[PDB]
């Protein structure tokens, strides 16, 4: 199946195609029916298997576009670095033109991301040291999130950020649909999934 | 997605119809799209979760009808008891008018089967010890086999047929599909998919 053969929205089937991207990969393709339906899914997936579209697409489709000013984010996506962060950030970009994603690091300080925050979001894009810091000032609003999505689980626990990453979630709506991916699934990783997801469905492409 | 968003014929959506059946159940949604392009998958699924229609709308999809007096089976479907043989070849003869389902068992006499075999079948619904029965008789032949279905496969471990699963695979061309069953994967089920499998996906609905 193509991607114009799942229901989509226009804006976002004409920025695919403004990209060559016709056919989704695996992960994609399983994942697709029920993340659209707004169901919570695991993806036990490697880099390269195409698993940020596979979450970029979901949050673009539910997220009608919104003008107002300082207006709190509805999707917010956890990474465990900068790097992964800005990669994500540009993706999801790409094919929710729709949106305006804010992406949130360390390694800087907090000035910049503070005025974008401030000015309003529709997706934020965040490590968790940085995303924890920003919502204990009050900068940062989770209130409002209608998906949250973990990435690279596993490498979040490894660089040590359960307990923000844990934060960061509980301060979510329960309401939240939750995509968590991750390509090991150590205990805390299922914990997670126990307490913060509703009868997620996993799909292992590995 | 309902079934009519989905690459089914004709004949198929409107046999759905007709039992009132519109909505996939996650299992089915996740498999469809990689099942209906040919792709091998690993189902953890209980019964009650429809993983039934996830395998037989591929098969029912997958084969054009025949007249061929005598033809040898293009699908395979393995089962643990004569019971959910019995109910595998009901529904999927409910979703494929087009094919012609022979359900093959044990305790019974050799007969009725035989002759139903040599008459011709599209797909074949067996439990394992009376298949290879016949495989070694000359009656079944599995040479044309494109898709093989493994439902259960811990169960049939349990019930010891693990030989018989094994040979009645080895007898089907390596070009086939795929696709296993099972709430449990015992490490034999694991080695079975690892050497008859192709890049399976694995969906888990448990």
Redesign the interface.
Known sequence: ?EFK???LKPEILEALHGRGLTT?T?IQ??????A??G?DLIG?ARTGTGKTLAFALPIAERLAPSQERGRKPRALVLTPTRELALQVASELTAVAPHLKVVAVYGGTGYGKQKEALLRGADAVVATPGRALDYLRQGVLDLSRVEVAVLDEADEMLSMGFEEEVEALLSATPPSRQTLLFSATLPSWAKRLAERYMKNP?????I
């Open positions: 199946m053969d799942f229901p989704p695996p393709a399983a994942a697709l029916p029920l659209l339906e169901k036990q469905v996993l799909i292992n492409v």
